[PDB]
Design a protein around this ligand. Structure first.
Ligand SMILES: N=C(NCCSC[C@H]1O[C@@H](n2cnc3c(NCCCc4ccccc4)ncnc32)[C@H](O)[C@@H]1O)NCC1CCCCC1
Ligand SMILES: [K+]
Ligand SMILES: [K+]
Ligand SMILES: [K+]
Length: 544
DNA sequence: ATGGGACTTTTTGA
DNA sequence: TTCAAAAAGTCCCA
């Protein structure tokens, strides 16, 4: 979890580069999760040069005996650097590092606190705040602790929110008037549904100076997280425009230049501005070309998928190894075919059509009692009885030990519907003809009856799989890792759709693609030509 | 050994 | 009663 030095230097320089040390020689710089002091040790170096370069001006303007170069080390540690961390071994190491910057005279007091930053009663605000807070999601966070966050941090922490939301809140709350904060956190709060309250909190309490979005790039080696750097202030400012630096190529190595600023100004990043006053509850962080593109589509389309469709998440068995068998597995001979459903994974979804299924789900909810079908329970499902019994609804009695945890409603699956993978590099919406069941890695919707005469499944997969809609969706989608976006209903169902003079031709092209994709000898190339023709029709329709 | 690519479970709050 | 969100993802190889 060590933050790379090139990022640490940038965040520290972002806050202190324009500090007027003559006007205020007592700046308070805080790291609320300082660890071993990746940031604070750099703050010390930057402060020391700042004081030494102006030592004679300070000696003249202020106590001429206090301001000597020999006194800078003590002054920094007594009045300027503040750290907090829950790990006492980390604080003990940082205290030793800060002491070793000078190399007892008299007992220098360092402002390091071993505590929970979210619980500490903070006695004063701070001029500058930097660091890299902990990230802990809803599954890994201790349940007794979550009761505390839901009580005391409800303005940013609810439901499936993350712990680092609370650090944004704490950092903002203890930032002095006119102060500057700069942190590196996961990027997901910029787009996620859970981050809505946090985005409202940031926008309405600080001026966001700058957002560095690394998208799917791997900033932390051997860590599966996607990062951003937020810089914000509480200055009295009227313009309130955000500098947004979005990475262009996710495969870039971060150390190509001596400094991060060189990387940002390079061709490896795009820069654009966003008006903070124009931010809705969603933050549309795109350049002017993309904003025009996005707005054209939004205004043109009179419907959304949510308007015309019923959406639902897939089956959640609660223990897949207990209920999912290969269709060639001999144990399926014990299971009556009335209990067996086709099962697909996200990899089975292509554009327009689903691979033939290779797995079967035992829809165990339809097993009436333990004595009629003893063989299935003893020889297939019962091999995982202990794990099945530990599921939440089994411990509370709502589920029998052999039942599916969230079996949903079979009738929603056993119908013509559209399916798409929950995480993908591109739009892949397929028409399911085979009553496929799936887990939560595949989402489904079917068309409401009253919209069937306006929209057909064949038309919908045509436009949703188009190049236009792939770009259109990815503008506001949640970037997860390198070449992975979330395709979840909370954004997929917000996709807006249109219907105009090109409807018949778009639908016809979609059927030709479906027909070719289902044939034995597939000449995939003609599909690409048809898709290009369809994309041109869609661009003609939307005026782009 | 590492960094990069394929692929994606069930726990959980509401 | 029962929905859907959540990557400090997870796992493997060359
Ligand atoms: N794998 C992880 N990676 C991220 C590392 S974060 C970097 C620094 O952040 C400090 N740090 C964290 N949480 C703090 C905090 N309050 C929140 C407390 C939340 C909590 C509640 C119950 C049980 C445990 C934690 N207050 C001040 N410092 C804090 C670390 O000690 C570290 O040196 N975190 C999970 C896990 C492991 C480290 C101990 C606890 C987190
Ligand atoms: K003086
Ligand atoms: K990443
Ligand atoms: K992992």
């Amino acid at each position: 979890y060590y933050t790379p030095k090139i990022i640490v230097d940038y965040i520290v320089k972002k806050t202190l580069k324009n500090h007027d040390i003559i006007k205020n020689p007592y700046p308070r710089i805080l790291d609320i999760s300082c660890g071993c002091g990746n940031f604070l040790l750099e703050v010390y170096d930057i402060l020391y040069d700042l004081f030494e370069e102006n030592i004679y001006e300070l000696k003249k303007k202020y106590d001429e005996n206090y301001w000597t170069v020999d006194n800078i080390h003590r002054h920094i540690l007594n009045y300027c650097i503040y750290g907090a961390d829950i790990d006492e071994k980390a604080i003990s190491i940082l205290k030793d590092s800060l002491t070793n910057k000078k190399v007892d005279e008299s007992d220098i007091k360092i402002n390091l606190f071993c505590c929970d930053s979210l619980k500490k009663k903070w006695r004063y605000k701070f001029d500058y705040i930097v660091g890299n807070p902990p990230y802990i999601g809803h599954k890994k966070l201790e349940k007794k602790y979550k009761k505390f966050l839901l009580e005391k941090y409800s303005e940013v922490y609810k439901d499936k929110a993350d712990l680092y939301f609370c650090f944004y809140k704490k950092i903002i709350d203890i930032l002095k008037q006119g102060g500057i904060g700069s942190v590196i956190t996961p990027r997901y709060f910029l787009e996620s549904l859970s981050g809505k309250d946090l985005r409202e909190y940031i926008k309405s309490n600080v001026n966001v100076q700058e957002i560095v979005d690394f998208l799917g790039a791997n900033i932390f080696k051997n860590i599966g997280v996607s990062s951003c750097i937020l810089t914000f202030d509480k200055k009295k400012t009227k313009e309130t425009y955000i500098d947004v630096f979005k990475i262009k190529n996710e495969d870039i190595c971060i150390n190509k230049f001596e400094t991060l600023e060189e990387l940002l100004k390079s061709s490896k990043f795009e820069h654009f501005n966003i008006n903070q006053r124009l931010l809705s509850d969603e933050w549309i962080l795109v350049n002017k070309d993309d904003e025009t593109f996005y707005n054209k589509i939004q205004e043109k389309c009179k419907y959304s998928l949510e308007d015309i469709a019923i959406s639902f998440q897939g089956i959640i068995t609660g223990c897949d190894k207990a209920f999912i068998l290969s269709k060639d597995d001999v144990k399926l001979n014990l299971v009556d075919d009335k209990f067996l459903k086709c099962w697909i994974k996200s990899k089975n979804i292509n554009k327009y059509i689903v691979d033939k299924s290779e797995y079967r789900l035992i829809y165990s909810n339809d097993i009436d009692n333990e004595n009629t079908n003893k063989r299935i329970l003893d020889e297939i499902i019962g091999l995982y009885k202990t794990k099945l019994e530990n599921r939440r609804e089994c411990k509370s009695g709502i589920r029998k030990w052999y039942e599916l945890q969230w079996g949903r409603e079979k009738l929603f699956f056993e119908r013509k519907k559209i399916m798409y993978p929950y995480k993908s590099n591109e739009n892949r919406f397929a028409i399911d003809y085979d009553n496929n069941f799936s887990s939560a890695d595949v989402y489904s919707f079917f068309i409401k009856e009253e919209y069937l005469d306006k929209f057909s499944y064949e038309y919908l997969v045509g436009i949703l799989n188009s190049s236009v809609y792939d770009k259109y969706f990815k503008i506001t989608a949640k970037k997860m890792s390198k070449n992975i976006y979330d395709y979840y209903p909370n954004k997929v169902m917000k996709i807006r759709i249109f219907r105009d003079n090109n409807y018949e031709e778009i639908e016809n092209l979609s059927k030709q693609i479906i027909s070719i994709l289902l044939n034995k000898s597939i000449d995939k190339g003609k599909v690409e030509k048809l898709q290009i023709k369809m994309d041109n029709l869609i661009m003609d329709s939307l005026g782009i």
